[PDB]
Design a protein around this ligand. Structure first.
Ligand SMILES: [Ca+2]
Ligand SMILES: [Ca+2]
Lengths: 137, 74
């Protein structure tokens, strides 16, 4: 069973809407030192922007929109890895639903990179994800 | 001489965001967190051999995102 589980949450939209996706995490109150991830969404939806703040960790997220990549370090003022703030977005994504999107369910999630680091030595947690359904009607 | 491995602050044989974490920690609490002599050499990746600062940690983050290249091995 995964050490930490991301909840992309579920959303409803109509064609033409922007959806704000708040990605939550449950680490079972374990601390996390850093994340380095990539995102995707089912076509024809697009991720238009990755927010540069992580509310769960009160830190700046570095992004590369060309690969939908994002990373950060999550340490307190003495360098200790942080427990994520319960209920707070770890990442926020802004998703565009084009005007001509057919009715359907379109998933947002990770795209083959989802690193969650434990410490300072390369050790990582195992990771799972759930939800991320954007139901367009 | 032993060839350096630019980016590999923690000397685990790969460059990834844990290297940025170690850099930050060594400045936040030097009593608790240190780099080895090799790690410190490895960690200075930008700034023209100015020493290790937060900009080195950020450069490793950029590298993990595909935005920059690490400096030459010596
Ligand atoms: Ca390393
Ligand atoms: Ca430097």
């Amino acid at each position: 069973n995964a050490d930490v589980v991301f909840d992309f949450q579920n959303y409803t939209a109509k064609a033409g809407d922007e959806v704000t996706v708040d990605v939550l995490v449950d680490s079972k109150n374990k601390p996390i030192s850093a994340m380095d991830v990539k995102f995707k969404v089912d076509s024809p939806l697009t991720i238009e922007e990755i927010d540069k703040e992580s509310l769960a960790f009160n830190t700046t997220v570095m992004t590369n929109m060309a690969i939908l990549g994002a990373n950060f370090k999550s340490l307190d003022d003495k360098g200790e890895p942080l427990v994520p703030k319960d209920g707070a977005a770890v990442f926020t994504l802004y998703v565009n639903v084009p005007a001509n999107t057919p009715d359907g369910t379109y998933y947002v999630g990770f795209n083959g990179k989802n690193e969650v680091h434990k410490s300072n030595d390369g050790s990582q947690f195992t990771v799972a994800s759930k939800n991320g359904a954007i139901t367009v009607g | 001489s032993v060839q350096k491995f630019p980016g590999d602050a923690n000397c685990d044989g790969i460059v990834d965001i844990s290297d940025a974490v170690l850099i930050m920690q060594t400045m936040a609490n030097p009593s608790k967190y240190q780099m080895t002599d090799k790690g410190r050499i490895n960690a200075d990746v930008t700034g023209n051999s100015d020493g290790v600062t937060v900009l080195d940690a950020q450069f490793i983050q950029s590298y993990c995102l595909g935005l920059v290249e690490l400096p030459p091995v010596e």
